[PDB]
From a paper:
Members of the ERH protein family are small proteins found in metazoan, invertebrates as well as plants. Closely related proteins, sharing around 30% sequence identity with human ERH, are also present in Schizosaccharomyces such as [name] and in few other fungi. [name] cooperates with Mmi1 to target meiosis-specific transcripts for degradation by the nuclear exosome. [name] not only suppresses the meiotic program in vegetative cells but also stimulates meiosis progression.
Larger crystals could be obtained by increasing the drop volume, varying the ammonium sulfate concentration and the buffer. From one of these crystals, we could collect a dataset of better quality from which we could determine [name] structure by molecular replacement using the structure of human ERH as initial model and refine it to 1.95 Å resolution. [name] monomer folds as an α-β protein composed of a four stranded anti-parallel β-sheet and three α helices packed onto the same face of the β-sheet. This fold is similar to that of metazoan ERH (rmsd values of 1.1–1.9 Å over 80 Cα atoms). Three copies (protomers A, B and C) of [name] protein are present in the asymmetric unit. Protomers A and B are virtually identical (rmsd values of 0.27 Å over 84 Cα atoms) while protomer C slightly differs as illustrated by its higher rmsd value when compared to the two other chains (1.3–1.4 Å over 84 Cα atoms). The largest differences between protomer C and the two other [name] molecules present in the asymmetric unit occur at helix α2 (2.5 Å translation along the helix longitudinal axis), at the hinge between helix α2 and the N-terminal extremity of strand β3, and to a lesser extent on helix α3 (1.3 Å translation). Among the three copies present in the asymmetric unit, protomers B and C associate to form a tight homodimer with a butterfly-like shape while the protomer A forms a similar homodimer with a symmetry-related molecule (rmsd of 1.1 Å over 160 Cα atoms). In the homodimer, the [name] β-sheet face from each monomer, which is not packed against α helices, interacts to form a β-barrel. Each monomer engages an area of 850 Å2 mostly formed by hydrophobic residues, which are strongly or strictly conserved within [name]/ERH orthologues from fungi, plants, insects, worm and animals.
Numbering used by the authors:
A (entry chain A), B (entry chain A): 6 to 46, 55 to 100
Write the structure that this text describes.
């Protein structure tokens, strides 16, 4: 219901690594995956980490239709690229 | 996208217990939470376990509108009650 973004992460096929987190904004979702990347150690290295080591899917809350919309991993990764280049 | 149900579980306020799972049916989602209950040990005991020890929220995929609809914990627990009484 409330949470703007629900993030679904996993490391390979291990069901024990399937961790979800709730975020009040896209910024908060981006800071979370940068956090995952930082604690488990460049744009190319960041993208490859989320293509080979971890997998992630954002579910974005559509307030008008009271529904969660799944978005592609590349959508969140592209927005993260815009955060990392600015900061 | 594909997964009929996404289950979000947690044990208290610990972010490390926030585990998600994907299910092809409501039956599969029910067998999963019965599994959680069985491995962490009656209708009254089952309901109280999911009201005090673990918390759970099902996200049900609406194929026509390509969206995940969050449902109340009681909705899944009520359906689980119908599975446990029959079996």
């Amino acid at each position: 219901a409330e949470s703007h973004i629900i993030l679904l992460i996993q490391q390979g096929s291990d069901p024990k690594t399937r961790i979800w987190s709730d975020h009040c904004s896209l910024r908060s979702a981006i800071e979370y995956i940068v956090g995952v990347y930082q604690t488990n150690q460049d744009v190319s290295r960041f993208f490859n980490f989320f293509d080979e080591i971890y997998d992630c899917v954002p579910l974005v809350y559509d307030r008008h239709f009271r529904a969660y919309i799944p978005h592609e991993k590349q959508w969140l990764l592209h927005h993260a690229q815009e955060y990392l280049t600015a900061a």
